[PDB]
Design a protein around this ligand. Structure first.
Ligand code: NA
Ligand code: NA
Ligand code: NA
Length: 323
DNA sequence: CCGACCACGCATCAGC
DNA sequence: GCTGATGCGA
DNA sequence: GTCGG
């Protein structure tokens, strides 16, 4: 209610930049602006007021001035009514259909889910799955269902080999009340950066008990697919969900878990901090920095805490990593 | 003024 | 056939 | 689009 009109406006602008104009950096600029504004504890009264926040520049300030004075933004109103642009933007909501595919589909008259349905031969495997679960994929996942999903994942993984180590990351691990998907990081003592079907066997067991229902992509270290909780007789059917499974070398596992648990703000801050202490932390490792800025060999990591110890930072619970 | 910004593994395309 | 680029959603 | 070297 505070600045929702402003944040929706910026978010909508972001989407058109990404999906229609294919300007990913403007996309992020608008989102960044929208985020900082979403956190501002005051109802913005002018573009000048908003420009004081990091991420809001001259143009977004001008756009806010227009929105506040007229209650709308001419450019956005025009874009919304544009048949071509609104269709391109809409099609990208289908997983598998990015800005490029959406643009090509619209160029040849394919503009709706209905048109996609009757042009199956023009969709790749991923896109067909995205169309099939269009609705389910836009629904969020309540934490209670995420817990039920975790139960199955951890149970089957252990059933395949009790030596596997699996961790469900994402906002879920930080305690979020709802998730958009499930991200499982996996490792095994037999797989390290130096020596090594570890992923395949887990994916297969999950398909055998009918938890995983579809495959978007699958290689030796990353699986992206679809899964669904079993429903009891009578009870309605749970919606299909997106699930990713990543096999990560044991010696890089904890740097992986840290990264994939975030938040993104927390990662940026933790990385920034590390640099201060003379360390460079990435998704895979934490390495010391020489006085001339040269990175040394990766330091041994056997828990998230080790990472924190290295940079002399107190261990913070996942729940307390909002930033 | 003008370049950074920019998760990377897997599916599929463009080219040889 | 293979190699590298591109699209895509992480 | 915004920031900043
Ligand atoms: Na600003
Ligand atoms: Na899409
Ligand atoms: Na090539």
């Amino acid at each position: 209610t505070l600045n929702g009109g402003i944040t929706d406006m910026l978010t909508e602008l972001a989407n058109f930049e990404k999906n229609v104009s294919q300007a990913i950096h403007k996309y992020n600029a608008y989102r960044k602006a929208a985020s900082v504004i979403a956190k501002y504890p005051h109802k913005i009264k002018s573009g000048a007021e908003a420009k004081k926040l990091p991420g809001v520049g001259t143009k977004i300030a001008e756009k806010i001035d227009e929105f506040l004075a007229t209650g709308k933004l001419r450019k956005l109103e025009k874009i919304r009514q544009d048949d071509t642009s609104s269709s391109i933007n809409f099609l990208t909501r289908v997983s598998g259909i990015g800005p490029s595919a959406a643009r090509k589909f619209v160029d040849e008259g394919i503009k709706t889910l209905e048109d996609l349905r009757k042009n199956e031969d023009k969709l790749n495997h991923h896109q067909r799955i995205g169309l099939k679960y269009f609705g389910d994929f836009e629904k969020r996942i309540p934490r209670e269902e995420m817990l039920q999903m975790q139960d199955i994942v951890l149970n089957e993984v252990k059933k395949v080999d009790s030596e596997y180590i699996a961790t469900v990351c994402g906002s879920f691990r930080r305690g979020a009340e709802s998730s958009g998907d499930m991200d499982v990081l996996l490792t095994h003592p037999s797989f390290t950066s130096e020596s090594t079907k570890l992923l395949h066997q887990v994916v297969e067991q999950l398909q055998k008990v009918h938890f995983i229902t579809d495959t978007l992509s699958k290689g030796e270290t990353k699986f992206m697919g679809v899964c669904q909780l079993p429903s009891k007789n009578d009870e309605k059917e749970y919606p299909h969900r997106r699930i990713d499974i990543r096999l990560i070398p044991k010696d890089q596992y904890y740097c992986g878990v840290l990264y994939f648990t975030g938040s993104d703000i927390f990662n940026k801050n933790m990385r920034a901090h590390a640099l201060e202490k003379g360390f460079t932390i990435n998704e895979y490792t934490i390495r010391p920095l020489g006085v001339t800025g040269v990175a040394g060999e990766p330091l041994p990591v056997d828990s998230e805490k080790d990472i924190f110890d290295y940079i002399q930072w107190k261990y913070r619970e996942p729940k307390d990593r909002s930033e």
